[PDB]
Design an enzyme around this catalytic site. Structure first.
Site, mmCIF file in Angstrom:
data_model
loop_
_atom_site.group_PDB
_atom_site.id
_atom_site.type_symbol
_atom_site.label_atom_id
_atom_site.label_comp_id
_atom_site.label_asym_id
_atom_site.label_seq_id
_atom_site.Cartn_x
_atom_site.Cartn_y
_atom_site.Cartn_z
ATOM 1 N N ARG C 26 52.821 73.536 -1.467
ATOM 2 C CA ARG C 26 52.327 73.691 -2.315
ATOM 3 C C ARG C 26 51.004 75.141 -1.733
ATOM 4 O O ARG C 26 51.084 75.677 -2.321
ATOM 5 C CB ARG C 26 50.809 72.711 -1.871
ATOM 6 N N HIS C 72 55.190 72.397 -14.643
ATOM 7 C CA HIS C 72 53.687 72.898 -13.538
ATOM 8 C C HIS C 72 53.033 71.150 -14.107
ATOM 9 O O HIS C 72 52.469 71.639 -15.041
ATOM 10 C CB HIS C 72 52.560 73.381 -13.416
ATOM 11 N N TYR C 116 40.634 85.138 -25.174
ATOM 12 C CA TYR C 116 40.198 86.147 -25.613
ATOM 13 C C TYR C 116 41.552 86.624 -25.288
ATOM 14 O O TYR C 116 41.217 88.516 -25.127
ATOM 15 C CB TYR C 116 38.675 86.165 -24.675
#
Ligand SMILES: COc1c(N2C[C@@H]3CCCN[C@@H]3C2)c(F)cc2c(=O)c(C(=O)O)cn(C3CC3)c12
Ligand SMILES: [Mg+2]
Ligand SMILES: [Mg+2]
Lengths: 98, 61, 190, 49, 135, 92, 49, 61, 67
Positions: C26, C72, C116
């Site tokens: 990680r 993922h 957006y």
DNA sequence: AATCACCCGCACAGATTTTTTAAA
DNA sequence: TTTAAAAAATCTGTGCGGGT
DNA sequence: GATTTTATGCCTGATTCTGTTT
DNA sequence: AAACAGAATCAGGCATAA
């Protein structure tokens, strides 16, 4: 260096440039902001000192014809509150120090 | 990701569930292990991890 | 039925599992390409989608959906936050993503939501994945065994030195500053 | 006063002070100077190093 | 946030500690509301081995857990004879992020309530991982 | 540079634009199939993805991302709320 | 007391009353009886009708 | 969806912006229009919408 | 705005800005919001409108490029 | 659609506790 | 022989980036 | 990953005024 | 000279949007 003697035999140390700087027409600043004096405690004599060396003494002359001699090295280090340097009696003041 | 019926019938039904019960064996090494693994000091934790997980796995003789 | 267990064994096994997983998968970068697993998966997904540097932009939601639906298995807000950092000129010395919209500022302002904005690959990011289709690296499985992901990228750029890294793990951490590309190339030639 | 020409921050000093002293105090007490500790750790053959 | 039961005898009741909101809702929907209670946990919990006592008292997750258990804390009013349930069951995901939460909860229980562990009131659940089907 | 305008004309044009858009494209169903535009777009996207009834499931985020990124130019939380209602046995 | 078999809600009747009056009061005051207003409007050739 | 520099240079720069200024013409029709379109009663609003959006559009010459 | 409200303490000579600009999107929801703001300004502060202090911005819609 | 609380290691400024030392 | 002031020596928050 | 405030139309239950009667 | 019927007003809930 600046040595300030108050109305009760207290001694304080200070630098010259630490004092307020102003013009000819200015009034000045109250010294109470720079020293922890009493309400009616006022300076009466100033002894400039360049540097401390050897074991020379400081001659102190007060009013009413009193004399005193002390070793300079006692004033080499001072705290925020000064130490008593002379036991004055009644309205007797230091007028001359060298 | 499981429907509630599946979750009930696989984990929560007393007739067909399996569980584990927690017990304490030594009570003098448990304090050492908890202090080592959950304490503030980092170096014992790093040494423990390096000794156990890294080197012991490479040689399981 | 109920079977007993000692507390020491449970503690040791669980903590070792967590620590090893965090250390190896990680938080630390590989020394060959300088990427964490999430960066590699994001770049691979964008490459598979056909999102090149000289074509039209695509909405961020589509890319995030693909990434968390095929490679993922975690949350999406953190993935979007990871994607945002790879496009800011005051974070990376050489940006890897090309952005269109409000992506924050050095003044401390936050970026807009992912409904957006739009993104596409940067020109230098095509040099990190050159000759990927000529069997130059190994492929591994995903969490289901349905897709395949590269194990490392066949990069032409010394990414670790030129972009740096920073991460926190269990028992250790890392902190590497960025450098200048021409100087690193000269050092490699020397 | 930052604008399209670049960053610009303005700090004004009184008449009873020196710019160098306040600048040094700002260096010491705020984040106008920071430390960066270098620690180079990475994965080599699947092991930290 | 507690979803209680109807039984009043503590020796015939169970309490579940679940990892998230989604699993908490799933457990609330498909339980036996006669003698089973649900208490959801949100986020990761405090590490009571690295923190101080007042910090542990001022944290809301730990405070709600202590209130739901009902024994009291502080070694001054801690009476393990007023436990409201005689079975505490820990249910988390089968990944590496559930092991961390299991360790944190075990640390809390062992450091703060030793008698509960000594008397055998703590359990761990075992959910399955796969499902196969051919016709 | 600066152009004057009367308030009545601006109000009338803007409100008529909004009202007609909402009437014809957001809230009423079509008599032939009985669907609103968002339902039709969701079903068409799922059909294009190949998400048939006898294959494996797919993550909801993937479908929502495709719908938002190709057909429906709005927010993504209301789309998920719409999808949820079409799967509840006590609603349909 | 709902379970896997189906919905089941139990209401206890006091000793000094008949159930029918309580049931009718519950019908009149709670959501055990509601109204449904029918209004069939749809789009035909791009027009509401 | 616009970069801040584009937004400035196209809309906010005083040397390139174009704007409109609002004025009142009659002041006796404005009150009635506001009351009809923004009021509480629904029937006048529906009638106005129908008249101005169906008959005046589908029929013309 | 800094003018007060209520027609009992409302003084239109305390306005802190002499230009008020409305900027919204180029779609239908922007039109709805513009109508709501105009309703507020006309019903509650008529003198501000009568003195020409209110403007409306106009952003572009397309961008074209070839080389 | 912004806001809120924890894990994990490291570096540092600022606030508290002990310990010494010159003045009455 | 007290007894206030230095003065050192310990503690305590905080933020960096992927996760719950 | 929960909670927080508006638009738009129709129906209902609870509360507050208003003229009437014993 | 208060009660008391009748009328008018006010919130809240339902599915897509900001
Ligand atoms: C509700 O949990 C979260 C909190 N909180 C937890 C705290 C204690 C309980 C009462 N709420 C507070 C706020 C939070 F502040 C942030 C996030 C968060 O950012 C996040 C994510 O995916 O980005 C996911 N979660 C959940 C998956 C853990 C967050
Ligand atoms: Mg988050
Ligand atoms: Mg919403």
């Amino acid at each position: 260096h600046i040595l300030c003697f108050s109305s009760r035999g207290r001694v304080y140390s200070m630098k010259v440039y630490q004092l307020p700087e102003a013009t000819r027409g200015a009034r000045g600043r109250p010294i109470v902001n720079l020293l922890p004096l009493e309400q009616d405690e006022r300076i009466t004599a100033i002894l400039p000192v360049t540097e401390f060396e050897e074991g020379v003494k400081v001659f102190m002359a007060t009013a009413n014809g009193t004399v005193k001699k002390t070793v300079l090295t006692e004033f080499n280090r001072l705290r925020t509150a000064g130490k008593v340097a002379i036991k004055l009696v009644d309205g007797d003041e230091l007028i001359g120090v060298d | 990701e499981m429907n509630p019926e599946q979750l009930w019938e696989t984990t929560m039904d007393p007739e067909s569930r399996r569980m584990l019960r927690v017990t304490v064996k030594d009570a003098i090494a448990a304090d050492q292990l908890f202090t080592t693994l959950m304490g503030d000091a980092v170096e014992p934790r790093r040494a423990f991890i390096e000794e156990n997980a890294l080197k012991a796995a490479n040689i399981d003789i | 039925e109920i079977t007993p267990v000692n507390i020491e064994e449970e503690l040791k096994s669980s903590y070792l599992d967590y620590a090893m997983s965090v250390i190896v998968g990680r938080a630390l970068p590989d020394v060959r390409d300088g990427l964490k697993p999430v960066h590699r998966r994001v770049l691979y997904a964008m490459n598979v989608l056909g999102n090149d540097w000289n074509k039209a932009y695509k909405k961020s939601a589509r890319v995030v959906g693909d990434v968390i639906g095929k490679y993922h298995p975690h949350g999406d807000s953190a993935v979007y936050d990871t994607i945002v950092r790879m496009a800011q000129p005051f974070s990376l010395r050489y940006m890897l993503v090309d952005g269109q919209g409000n992506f924050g500022s050095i003044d401390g302002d936050s970026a807009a939501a992912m409904r957006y904005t739009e993104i596409r690959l940067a020109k230098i990011a095509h040099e990190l994945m050159a000759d990927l289709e000529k069997e130059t690296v190994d492929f591994v499985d995903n969490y289901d065994g349905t897709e395949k992901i590269p194990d490392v990228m066949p990069t032409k750029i010394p990414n670790l030195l030129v972009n740096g890294s920073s991460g926190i793990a269990v028992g250790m951490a890392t902190n590497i500053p960025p450098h200048n590309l021409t100087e690193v190339i000269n050092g490699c030639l020397a | 006063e930052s604008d399209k020409d670049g960053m610009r921050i303005v700090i004004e000093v009184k008449r009873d002070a020196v710019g160098e002293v306040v600048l040094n105090n700002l260096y010491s007490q705020t984040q106008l100077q920071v430390s960066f500790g270098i620690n180079m750790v990475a994965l080599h053959h699947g092991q930290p190093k | 946030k507690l979803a209680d039961c109807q039984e009043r005898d503590p020796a015939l009741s169970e309490l579940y500690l679940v990892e998230g909101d989604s699993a908490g809702g799933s457990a609330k929907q498909g339980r036996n509301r006669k003698n089973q209670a649900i208490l959801p946990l949100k986020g990761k919990i405090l590490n009571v081995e690295k923190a101080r006592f007042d910090k542990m008292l001022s944290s809301q997750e730990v405070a709600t857990l202590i209130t739901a258990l009902g024994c009291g804390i502080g070694r001054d009013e801690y009476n393990p004879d007023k436990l409201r349930y005689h079975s505490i069951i820990i249910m988390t995901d089968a990944d590496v992020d559930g092991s961390h939460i299991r360790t944190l909860l075990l640390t809390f229980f062992y450091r703060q309530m030793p008698e509960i562990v000594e008397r055998g009131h703590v359990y761990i659940a075992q959910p399955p991982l796969y499902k196969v089907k051919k016709g």
